Design a protein around this nucleic acid. Structure first.
Lengths: 52, 49, 51
DNA sequence: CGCATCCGTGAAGCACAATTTAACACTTTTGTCAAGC
DNA sequence: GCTTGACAAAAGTGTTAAATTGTGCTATACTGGGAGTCACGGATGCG
């Protein structure tokens, strides 16, 4: 849930300034601190395949 | 639910088809929920007058 | 004490009661053994593994 | 039986219940000491 | 060859709070996807 919230906010807020939001901008609107945001971004990671 | 090994459903020859005496397309229809097949019938209501 | 023969380390009193001595007696003999073995004359052979 | 022709295969967001973490006071035990018997 | 006792640090018990995880629920109406072909041997059939 919170991962989707972060994704939607990151996608949407770009039009306000023309940049991909960084932890400062994301935290300014997610009501959470940057370190938790970094932890969420790490948690949203997905494994690659060895067979490539 | 049961499942059939693909190596034997098809492969020219289809071992399952030869074993049961069904054509590959007819067998394909049965395994893959496209047509019904009669498993057995009782003579007590075929030769009963 | 170090459980070298079984793998289970033992406390002082636990190995004082297998003999007929108190836990502090075990501590005293352990101190004697540590002082004697820690001396370089014997530690010179054992040190080279992670000197 | 001698072979041609067609056929299929391979190549949007919350509420409440239940579970799990890691704070802290307190208790017990474990390790340590001088002095000494 | 070693005891009595006294202190402080480390190893356990238990209650409580906080967070973490799982299931359910939302009432105008809307009703059936979409993606960049040829060559080879084997089964069938002709006389």
């Amino acid at each position: 849930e919170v991962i989707n919230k972060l994704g939607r906010i990151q996608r949407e807020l770009l039009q306000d300034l023309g940049r991909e939001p960084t932890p400062e901008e994301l935290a300014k609107e997610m009501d959470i601190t940057p370190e938790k945001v970094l932890e969420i971004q790490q948690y949203a990671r997905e494994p690659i395949s060895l067979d490539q | 639910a049961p499942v059939t090994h693909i190596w034997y459903f098809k492969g020219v020859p289809s071992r399952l088809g030869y074993l049961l005496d069904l054509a590959p397309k007819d067998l394909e229809k049965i395994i893959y929920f496209a047509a019904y097949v009669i498993t057995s019938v009782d003579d007590e209501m075929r030769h009963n007058e | 004490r170090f459980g070298l023969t079984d793998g289970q380390p033992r406390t002082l009193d636990e190995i004082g009661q297998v003999y007929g001595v108190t836990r502090e007696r075990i501590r005293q003999i352990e101190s004697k053994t540590m002082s004697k073995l820690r001396h370089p004359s014997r530690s010179q052979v054992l040190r080279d593994y992670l000197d």
